[PDB]
Amino acid sequence: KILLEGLHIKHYVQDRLLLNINRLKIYQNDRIGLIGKNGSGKTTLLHILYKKIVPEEGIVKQFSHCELIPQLKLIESTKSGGEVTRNYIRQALDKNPELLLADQPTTNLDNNYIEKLEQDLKNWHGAFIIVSHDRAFLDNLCTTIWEIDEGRITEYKGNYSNYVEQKELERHREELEYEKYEKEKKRLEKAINIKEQKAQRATKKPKNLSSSEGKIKVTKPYFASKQKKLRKTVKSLETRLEKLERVEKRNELPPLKMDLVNLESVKNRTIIRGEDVSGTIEGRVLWKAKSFSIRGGDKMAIIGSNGTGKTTFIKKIVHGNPGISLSPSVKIGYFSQKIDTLELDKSILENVQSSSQQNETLIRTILARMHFFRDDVYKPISVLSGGERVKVALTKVFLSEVNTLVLDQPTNFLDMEAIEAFESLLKEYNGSIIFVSHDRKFIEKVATRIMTIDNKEIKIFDGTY
Amino acid sequence: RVNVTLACTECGDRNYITTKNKRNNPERVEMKKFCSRENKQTLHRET
RNA sequence: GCGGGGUGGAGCAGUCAGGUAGCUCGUCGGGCUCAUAACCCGAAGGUCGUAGGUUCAAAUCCUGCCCCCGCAA
RNA sequence: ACAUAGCAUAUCAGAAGGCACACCCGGAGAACUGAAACAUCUUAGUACCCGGAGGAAGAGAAAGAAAAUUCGAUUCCCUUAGUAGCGGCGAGCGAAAUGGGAAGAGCCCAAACCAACAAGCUUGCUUGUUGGGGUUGUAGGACACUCUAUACGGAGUUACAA
RNA sequence: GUGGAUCCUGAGUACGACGGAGCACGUGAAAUUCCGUCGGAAUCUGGGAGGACCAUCUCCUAAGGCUAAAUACUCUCUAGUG
RNA sequence: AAGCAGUAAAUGUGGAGCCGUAGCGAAAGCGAGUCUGAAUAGGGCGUUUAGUAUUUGGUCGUAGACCCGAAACCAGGUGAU
RNA sequence: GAGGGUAGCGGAGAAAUUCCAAUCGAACCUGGAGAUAGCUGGUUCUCUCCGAAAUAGCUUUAGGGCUAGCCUCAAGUGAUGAUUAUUGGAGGUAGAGCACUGUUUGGACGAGGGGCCCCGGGUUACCGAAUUCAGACAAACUCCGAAUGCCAAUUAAUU
RNA sequence: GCUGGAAGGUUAAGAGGAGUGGUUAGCUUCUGCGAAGCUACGAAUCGAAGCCCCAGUAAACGGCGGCCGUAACUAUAACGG
RNA sequence: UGAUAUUGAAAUUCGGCACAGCUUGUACAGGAUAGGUAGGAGCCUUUGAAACGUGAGCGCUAGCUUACGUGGAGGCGCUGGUGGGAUACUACCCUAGCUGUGUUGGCUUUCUAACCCGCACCACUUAUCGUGGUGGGAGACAGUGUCAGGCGGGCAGUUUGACUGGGGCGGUCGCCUCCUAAAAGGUAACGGAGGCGCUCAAAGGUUCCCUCAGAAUGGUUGGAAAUCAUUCAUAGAGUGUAAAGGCAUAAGGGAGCUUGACUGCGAGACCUACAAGUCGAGCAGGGUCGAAAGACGGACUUAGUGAUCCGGUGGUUCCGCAUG
RNA sequence: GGAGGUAUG
Numbered sequence A: 001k002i003l004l005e006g007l008h009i010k011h012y013v014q015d016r017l018l019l020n021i022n023r024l025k026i027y028q029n030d031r032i033g034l035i036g037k038n039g040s041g042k043t044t045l046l047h048i049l050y051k052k053i054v055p056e057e058g059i060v061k062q063f064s065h066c067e068l069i070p071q072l073k074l075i076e077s078t079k080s081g082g083e084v085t086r087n088y089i090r091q092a093l094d095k096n097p098e099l100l101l102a103d104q105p106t107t108n109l110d111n112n113y114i115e116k117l118e119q120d121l122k123n124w125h126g127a128f129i130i131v132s133h134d135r136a137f138l139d140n141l142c143t144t145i146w147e148i149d150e151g152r153i154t155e156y157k158g159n160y161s162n163y164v165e166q167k168e169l170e171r172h173r174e175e176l177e178y179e180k181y182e183k184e185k186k187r188l189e190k191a192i193n194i195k196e197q198k199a200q201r202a203t204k205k206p207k208n209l210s211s212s213e214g215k216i217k218v219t220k221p222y223f224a225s226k227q228k229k230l231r232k233t234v235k236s237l238e239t240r241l242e243k244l245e246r247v248e249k250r251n252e253l254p255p256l257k258m259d260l261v262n263l264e265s266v267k268n269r270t271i272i273r274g275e276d277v278s279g280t281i282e283g284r285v286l287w288k289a290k291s292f293s294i295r296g297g298d299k300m301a302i303i304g305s306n307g308t309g310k311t312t313f314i315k316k317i318v319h320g321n322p323g324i325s326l327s328p329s330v331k332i333g334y335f336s337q338k339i340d341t342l343e344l345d346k347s348i349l350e351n352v353q354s355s356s357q358q359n360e361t362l363i364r365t366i367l368a369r370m371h372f373f374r375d376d377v378y379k380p381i382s383v384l385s386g387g388e389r390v391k392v393a394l395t396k397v398f399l400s401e402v403n404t405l406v407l408d409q410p411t412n413f414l415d416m417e418a419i420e421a422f423e424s425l426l427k428e429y430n431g432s433i434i435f436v437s438h439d440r441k442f443i444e445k446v447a448t449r450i451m452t453i454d455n456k457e458i459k460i461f462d463g464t465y
Numbered sequence B: 001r002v003n004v005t006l007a008c009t010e011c012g013d014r015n016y017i018t019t020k021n022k023r024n025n026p027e028r029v030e031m032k033k034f035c036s037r038e039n040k041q042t043l044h045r046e047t
Numbered sequence C: 001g002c003g004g005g006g007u008g009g010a011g012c013a014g015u016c017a018g019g020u021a022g023c024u025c026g027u028c029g030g031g032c033u034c035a036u037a038a039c040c041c042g043a044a045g046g047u048c049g050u051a052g053g054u055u056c057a058a059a060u061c062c063u064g065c066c067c068c069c070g071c072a073a
Numbered sequence D: 001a002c003a004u005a006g007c008a009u010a011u012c013a014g015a016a017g018g019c020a021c022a023c024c025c026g027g028a029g030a031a032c033u034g035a036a037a038c039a040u041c042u043u044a045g046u047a048c049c050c051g052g053a054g055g056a057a058g059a060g061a062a063a064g065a066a067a068a069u070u071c072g073a074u075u076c077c078c079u080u081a082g083u084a085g086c087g088g089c090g091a092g093c094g095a096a097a098u099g100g101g102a103a104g105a106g107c108c109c110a111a112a113c114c115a116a117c118a119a120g121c122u123u124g125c126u127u128g129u130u131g132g133g134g135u136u137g138u139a140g141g142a143c144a145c146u147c148u149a150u151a152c153g154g155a156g157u158u159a160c161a162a
Numbered sequence E: 001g002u003g004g005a006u007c008c009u010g011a012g013u014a015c016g017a018c019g020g021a022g023c024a025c026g027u028g029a030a031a032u033u034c035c036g037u038c039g040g041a042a043u044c045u046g047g048g049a050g051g052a053c054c055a056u057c058u059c060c061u062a063a064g065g066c067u068a069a070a071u072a073c074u075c076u077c078u079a080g081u082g
Numbered sequence F: 001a002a003g004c005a006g007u008a009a010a011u012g013u014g015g016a017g018c019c020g021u022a023g024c025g026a027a028a029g030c031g032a033g034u035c036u037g038a039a040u041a042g043g044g045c046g047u048u049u050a051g052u053a054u055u056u057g058g059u060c061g062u063a064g065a066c067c068c069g070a071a072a073c074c075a076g077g078u079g080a081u
Numbered sequence G: 001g002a003g004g005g006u007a008g009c010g011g012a013g014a015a016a017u018u019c020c021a022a023u024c025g026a027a028c029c030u031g032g033a034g035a036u037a038g039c040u041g042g043u044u045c046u047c048u049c050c051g052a053a054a055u056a057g058c059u060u061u062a063g064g065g066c067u068a069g070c071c072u073c074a075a076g077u078g079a080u081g082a083u084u085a086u087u088g089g090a091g092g093u094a095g096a097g098c099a100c101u102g103u104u105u106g107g108a109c110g111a112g113g114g115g116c117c118c119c120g121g122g123u124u125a126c127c128g129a130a131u132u133c134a135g136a137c138a139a140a141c142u143c144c145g146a147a148u149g150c151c152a153a154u155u156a157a158u159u
Numbered sequence H: 001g002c003u004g005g006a007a008g009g010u011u012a013a014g015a016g017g018a019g020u021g022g023u024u025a026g027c028u029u030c031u032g033c034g035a036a037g038c039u040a041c042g043a044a045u046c047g048a049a050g051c052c053c054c055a056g057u058a059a060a061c062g063g064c065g066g067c068c069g070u071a072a073c074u075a076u077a078a079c080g081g
Numbered sequence I: 001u002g003a004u005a006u007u008g009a010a011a012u013u014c015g016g017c018a019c020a021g022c023u024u025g026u027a028c029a030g031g032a033u034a035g036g037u038a039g040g041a042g043c044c045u046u047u048g049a050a051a052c053g054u055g056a057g058c059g060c061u062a063g064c065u066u067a068c069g070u071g072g073a074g075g076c077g078c079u080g081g082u083g084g085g086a087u088a089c090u091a092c093c094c095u096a097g098c099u100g101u102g103u104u105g106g107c108u109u110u111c112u113a114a115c116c117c118g119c120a121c122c123a124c125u126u127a128u129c130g131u132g133g134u135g136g137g138a139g140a141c142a143g144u145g146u147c148a149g150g151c152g153g154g155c156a157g158u159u160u161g162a163c164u165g166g167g168g169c170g171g172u173c174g175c176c177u178c179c180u181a182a183a184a185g186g187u188a189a190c191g192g193a194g195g196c197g198c199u200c201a202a203a204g205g206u207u208c209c210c211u212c213a214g215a216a217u218g219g220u221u222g223g224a225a226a227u228c229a230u231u232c233a234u235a236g237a238g239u240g241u242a243a244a245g246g247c248a249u250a251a252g253g254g255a256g257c258u259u260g261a262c263u264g265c266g267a268g269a270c271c272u273a274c275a276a277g278u279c280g281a282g283c284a285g286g287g288u289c290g291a292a293a294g295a296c297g298g299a300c301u302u303a304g305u306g307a308u309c310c311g312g313u314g315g316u317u318c319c320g321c322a323u324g
Numbered sequence J: 001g002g003a004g005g006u007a008u009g
């Protein structure tokens, strides 16, 4: 079967072309891993295919019906992240879609429910498109891969490893062909120059030619025709040079580079302390009353399954002093598991500068390192993609005057090439950080005081393994 | 900055062409213009 | 007259596509050593030739000027 | 190994080959040129080569033109008309029907079926040759039925037998 | 001449796909018609055509042969002409 | 016109056909007015009559097209004395 | 030396673009064929009337062409043409001038810097400038502005 | 360039036949729906060599560097970057 | 190089479809291996519960599966709790594998009978041709035909600008504005200087209001140059963007409302070889603003473009090869 | 207990 078609779709999103798509087709028994950097067009495209978002230009026709488990879900913090996402997955696979459209289904999950989900989707016989950035997840799940580069949807039979391999060889092939072109052009231009020198020599008299030979004046046309011959040859070479197949570099974006403006670190004997924090809401012991203490320079981590209470632990840190003992030195930078920014505040600039006191050029430069360009920092914050909302939250919380960072689910929507910058920044941060994350392999670099919540009790050790 | 075809929101007839910044006026732009069939000045969106 | 260039002391990236100036050797102080070299630890040293504009942001784009290299003359 | 090439002997107004620097049918088939260059296109299915036949050739008695009160083989002249169309919609190529005239002519086979003979010798009735019969669209014929009539007639060696 | 019980009325044929040509008609919406390859019908309640294709209505009855005339030319013979 | 008769004649015959008498509009179509157009407005093109047949001359087109004059291209053949 | 073989979209070549019947950047003959020639040359008797052009625009166009412009013939309109007188008008030239734009001389002050001496103060000096007196430059300066030429006229005359 | 390798990718004819569309026997409630049949298009998927790719080959094609500093005269620089 | 005829017979093997059977189903938490739905409070039990043992399948190494022998009465569930979802039990089904019956092809070889042997021998025959015959080899490949892809100066047909102080290089080719340009207009050169291939949903339309730059002086972060206050100042500012011509009775700068950056046209004019380009009152329709008069078919003006053929998209009281 | 081979100054 077919299940869907899309024809001559153009989605400009602003002046910039986001998507130029032809003969989009996703048939029965089809399992597609869609990928691209932040801001590439993934969530937008899937919304178009689910018909929720009609484009500026083009046709879509779905033959079998669909279900779109959403991202940036608009639903209030009555439950935990992860639990919400579990609920939406369950909705989808209850509804019997025959095409499942997933934009980041692995958000705020635990590895265990992830394992159930990959098992469900291997046992699954329908179709799907899926967006994760989880390498092993896709390597298990998918059969086809799509790449959004600049609206151009490149298709790739196999596994995310095959994507890496194919794109590697294509990058390499392209660079080599470019070097070949440059080298050839260089050579022919040099030839042109030499041949022109000779052509200019052709007409000028020699040296030490006396009276009778100099007064000779009949041979001017002979030499002029010889000069025309050599210059005709330069014309031939220039023609060849034009007939060369021009070939470009890719305008490759500069890499991600995050910053922390300064921590004048003091490293004193203790930053946080607390004792017997009764962890509950009502009728539920989320965790036992326990103490804790955090010291100068600690890359504290948290590891817990769903519905444990990591988020609430961090909320107890950030507000209230029940069994807590803080100091006036620590100035928390709170990055939430939710947005924390102002949606329709009329600029990233404003929403950031609210909490920081620094120069416009430094802040727009940091945003430019995050790849928010000159005309993009006035974009609203609601319009944005998830990963770039996350980046802007992080920047606001960096340029906040802080020394301890408190990060509930970072690295969540971000891409594989900003999570590495983030990995390295946190590795190299002279100060304290506290955070949640389900990625032990991210944590391998980072953690120095690993925690673990489980079974309504707590444990805390030091170092990785 | 790009070409633009308008169209009436009660018959569907284009009736006008113009131009706009796709940056500064990004949305599906709409203005009231005469429509030669209804013989009334009618709201015409873009298509 | 035409065409390329001028980024700490030397040689090279970065300019095409504007987003916090980088690499090797060197220089300075301290170490090791019987002393010097190597080696180990730190630190300086760059109005990106200059003067104007555009930009929130200039080595980067535009202008003008002073040199350097070839060709010529 | 039967017999099959092959080989030997007799008979043919049997063929060949020439041409009228013409006419016709078929094979195979250019380029200069023009397009203000050129490659599709044109030149041109032209010229040259080749085969064959005739005094004429070819085509030809609708699996057709058409669209009214329809016409009744073909071919050829006129006119339709440089129209309709074909066309790098460029250069340019370019009809036909209708309608008016010359001339006018229509016939035979295959199949069904009958009969004789031969192979199977079903000894049942399948196959083949011969002779009969029969040939078309407002469907026809075999098959059965009724009238005739055995050259009275009718037609012929330009088709319809020679 | 009547009758309509059954039998017969042209097969690797028509047609189609591909490639080509020829039809005034350059593949074009390309009907009609030949060739090569491959595949492959129907059977008178049939088959074909009326410029893609379908239906209706009308006209014929493919895949088998013969057929003068009117038309073309002139080596040549005769009689003549400008 | 062809064709028929006629002395290779004129001439007779033949009215298929052709131009014209009505245009406008892409066309359906309407009609001295039509097309545009909402319009009876305005405008375009037309009306408010003479064309036709043969022919002299001139010019143009198609045919070698005022004469001569290439280097060259193609096809078929002749040449190793 | 003989007898012979290889044939032109070819053959032979101890290789030179060399030979293939006194010429080979692809033989000779015939035909297509009167190839094509925007190129040169030539184009035959007389008289009469009128009588140019060598310019614009476009042109794979520049020594070719098409259209206009200038010519001739015919039919028609019918004084609409020419010249001058007068009136009016548009326009910024030669000249002249410095009222702006830029250039420039010599002065009077200076606006305050700079080199140098000891916070301030000096200087046989640049003077960036500002102002002012006098004299000067201009195709792309003009407060001004001719003669001519032009466009017309309910005008007159000559043609 | 040639030689070998052959994983993977891209890649035709043909095989395959999802889906769209035309007609219409019947239904219709307003003029819409529309079986089969015949038709015009026709996707996914399969689908060789080649190409991308890996290696080798130079009596194969072919190619063979700059700038700066430096030693008992100064020049040069065995030497260094 | 591949498909397809020539072009056959056998089989292993691998796959896809159907049907039958053996079954098989572990995220974390939870009593532990929780497949889907429904029914579900009883199911099993001397026709043998638990427990002991082997054998054996699966397996995530937890454990379930079941052929059995000893054994002889409990074992399991709703409830409980957990968890997204409840366990017994049963009806039907699904995943995954295996097995089987049948289809369905494919690769793979095997064979011989087509086809092939410039293999041998025999005869025609005296013959190195050929034909036939026999025997060996190869074999449904090759070779041949049609269709398709790739390579392919081996070969052919052709293209491969113009201007221009000779040609050539260099430069230019179209459009806009100044000067040359000789006071109308027009006017050339490889004469001199510069720009264009856009931009603006307001920088348009309209109605209201406002008038600049620069200097002196006073004043914090000091050329007091930022911003302010006054006086002077008629244009030296600004006019999106080149220059010129113009605008301060604003064409410049702000504010409010809007979409005339409308439809159908268009007398008469400019320029003009043509094709095109420009201006355009005014009429009608239907309107924004303004109290009204009235302004408004873009922008202070002049550049900001590209013929036809062709194809694409939309609409239509247009044809539609007999009729529809 | 002894013999033989097996970085600068």
Ligand SMILES: Nc1ncnc2c1ncn2[C@@H]1O[C@H](COP(=O)(O)OP(=O)(O)OP(=O)(O)O)[C@@H](O)[C@H]1O
Pocket: A013, A014, A018, A036, A037, A038, A039, A040, A041, A042, A043, A044, A045, A379, A383, A384, A385, A386, A387, A388, A413
């Ligand atoms: N309405 C809008 N206007 C302007 N920019 C927009 C608009 N909507 C989206 N964008 C920008 O275009 C891109 C939108 O793509 P999309 O939301 O699909 O991203 P994504 O692939 O889902 O990203 P991520 O991995 O961050 O979730 C982002 O760059 C976003 O900033």
Ligand SMILES: Nc1ncnc2c1ncn2[C@@H]1O[C@H](COP(=O)(O)OP(=O)(O)OP(=O)(O)O)[C@@H](O)[C@H]1O
Pocket: A077, A078, A079, A080, A081, A082, A083, A108, A109, A110, A281, A286, A304, A305, A306, A307, A308, A309, A310, A311, A312, A313
């Ligand atoms: N208002 C509330 N009412 C009831 N329960 C709540 C409320 N807020 C939170 N909870 C529950 O408290 C627990 C909080 O979970 P929390 O978000 O802290 O966990 P976590 O470690 O971040 O896990 P994850 O994000 O992966 O779900 C969850 O059980 C959540 O359902």
Ligand SMILES: [K+]
Pocket: E030
């Ligand atoms: K055809």
Ligand SMILES: [K+]
Pocket: D064, E049, E059, E060
């Ligand atoms: K017919």
Ligand SMILES: [K+]
Pocket: none
């Ligand atoms: K000779």
Ligand SMILES: [Mg+2]
Pocket: A042, A043, A071, A103, A104, A385, A386
């Ligand atoms: Mg997303």
Ligand SMILES: [Mg+2]
Pocket: A080, A081, A310, A311, A337
């Ligand atoms: Mg949470």
Ligand SMILES: [Mg+2]
Pocket: D034, D035
């Ligand atoms: Mg030509």
Ligand SMILES: [Mg+2]
Pocket: none
């Ligand atoms: Mg055929």
Ligand SMILES: [Mg+2]
Pocket: none
């Ligand atoms: Mg000779």
Ligand SMILES: [Mg+2]
Pocket: G032
């Ligand atoms: Mg000829």
Ligand SMILES: [Mg+2]
Pocket: none
């Ligand atoms: Mg005279």
Ligand SMILES: [Mg+2]
Pocket: none
């Ligand atoms: Mg003067």
Ligand SMILES: [Mg+2]
Pocket: none
């Ligand atoms: Mg002057």
Ligand SMILES: [Mg+2]
Pocket: I153
């Ligand atoms: Mg060649």
Ligand SMILES: [Mg+2]
Pocket: none
């Ligand atoms: Mg030619």
